Amino acid sequence: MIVLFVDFDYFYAQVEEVLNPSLKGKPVVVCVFSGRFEDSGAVATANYEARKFGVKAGIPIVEAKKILPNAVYLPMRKEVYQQVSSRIMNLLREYSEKIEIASIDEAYLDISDKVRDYREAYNLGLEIKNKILEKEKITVTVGISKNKVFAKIAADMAKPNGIKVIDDEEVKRLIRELDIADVPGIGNITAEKLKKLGINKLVDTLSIEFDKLKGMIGEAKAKYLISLARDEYNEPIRTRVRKSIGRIVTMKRNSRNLEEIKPYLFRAIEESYYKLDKRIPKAIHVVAVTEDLDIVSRGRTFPHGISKETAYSESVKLLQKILEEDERKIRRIGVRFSKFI
DNA sequence: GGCACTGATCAGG
DNA sequence: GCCTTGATCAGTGCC
Numbered sequence A: 001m002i003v004l005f006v007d008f009d010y011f012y013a014q015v016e017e018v019l020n021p022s023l024k025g026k027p028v029v030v031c032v033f034s035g036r037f038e039d040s041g042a043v044a045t046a047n048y049e050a051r052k053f054g055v056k057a058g059i060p061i062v063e064a065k066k067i068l069p070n071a072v073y074l075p076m077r078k079e080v081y082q083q084v085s086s087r088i089m090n091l092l093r094e095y096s097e098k099i100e101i102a103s104i105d106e107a108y109l110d111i112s113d114k115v116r117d118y119r120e121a122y123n124l125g126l127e128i129k130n131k132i133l134e135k136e137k138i139t140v141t142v143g144i145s146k147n148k149v150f151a152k153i154a155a156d157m158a159k160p161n162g163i164k165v166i167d168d169e170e171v172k173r174l175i176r177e178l179d180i181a182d183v184p185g186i187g188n189i190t191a192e193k194l195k196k197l198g199i200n201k202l203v204d205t206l207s208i209e210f211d212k213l214k215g216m217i218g219e220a221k222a223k224y225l226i227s228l229a230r231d232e233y234n235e236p237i238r239t240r241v242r243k244s245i246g247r248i249v250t251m252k253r254n255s256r257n258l259e260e261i262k263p264y265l266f267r268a269i270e271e272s273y274y275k276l277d278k279r280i281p282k283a284i285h286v287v288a289v290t291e292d293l294d295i296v297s298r299g300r301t302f303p304h305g306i307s308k309e310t311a312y313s314e315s316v317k318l319l320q321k322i323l324e325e326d327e328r329k330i331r332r333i334g335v336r337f338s339k340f341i
Numbered sequence B: 001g002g003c004a005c006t007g008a009t010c011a012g013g
Numbered sequence C: 001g002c003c004t005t006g007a008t009c010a011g012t013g014c015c
């Protein structure tokens, strides 16, 4: 099997440069402002000119400005990026009907039936890069290997504006030498659990007793890692379907007052139904982010679709449930809908 | 024993 | 900050 993975470079910031080419060569930081005070919010992404100096996704805007006070700080325009992304995704469908759109800026193509070997695959990857550059003036990185996991590791290694193949021999090398923390799906908490077991490379998971592994990180991740170490991971490229759609808004001030919270909750419902478009959910969850930033949620599933009127009345009941069962003040409040008809 | 369902967790974009 | 193109866990009700 041959998998080609495409990952768009510094995507949000790059779209902003395409739309305003005077930004080219300047550090650009795309921000999500929460509106609680001035410059409250977090960085969504930054282009490489900013990232070079430590301005990275997730950090506080105030922290970014301490590092690069003269960078260009732009508000996130996700609707614009989403529309640009959709156009590029339509470009990719021309190269394979087996395509898995994995997020707003990534896709997997199964090109098993389009090329014979890694040489032809590399050439097709070049063709894809040039096409997206030609039509949308966006640069991407391409990773190619025998499965989705190594195709992604390949792209990680070639970023930015690159292309890389991980052939069968290199796959065997990585199983021995790749830092296990760098395997997709292994986050800090799991990486720490593993280190405490002495596992530092995929190969190590083959010699440890399975129940030990499973007891620490769970059955699913244990099997996942072992399948990879044995060079036996194969998951097909699958069409992804949206399963939940929601909106969460930050309140001006932390509160436990129902009447205070309601106007924000109802705004989240309005925006959520807008995003639902033609989908009709049978389930609704109210989702509260506490002051200490924990997340608490309560839901309700109906044997029928939920009208916006039913969303309003049920959401208040669920929020009350949350207030009844947790005593912390709420900082953000929202809803998420799912189980579409 | 194991399926179906919930809310919490961990992950990653 | 915000979103799920999320999956999996423990706890449970149930057959």
Ligand SMILES: Nc1ccn([C@H]2C[C@H](O)[C@@H](COP(=O)(O)OP(=O)(O)OP(=O)(O)O)O2)c(=O)n1
Residues within 6 Å of the ligand: A007, A008, A009, A010, A011, A012, A013, A043, A044, A045, A046, A057, A058, A104, A105, A159, A160, B013
């Ligand atoms: N914590 C994060 C990470 C990413 N994103 C958004 C903005 C990114 O542009 C996009 C893609 O994520 P990458 O993780 O693919 O980021 P870039 O595409 O920004 O960087 P790179 O060139 O390393 O791929 O998703 C976000 O909102 N919040």
Ligand SMILES: [Ca+2]
Residues within 6 Å of the ligand: A007, A008, A009, A010, A011, A105
């Ligand atoms: Ca990217």
Ligand SMILES: [Ca+2]
Residues within 6 Å of the ligand: A007, A008, A103, A105, A106, B013
């Ligand atoms: Ca990405």
Ligand SMILES: [Ca+2]
Residues within 6 Å of the ligand: A181, A182, A183, A186, A187, A188, A191
């Ligand atoms: Ca990691």
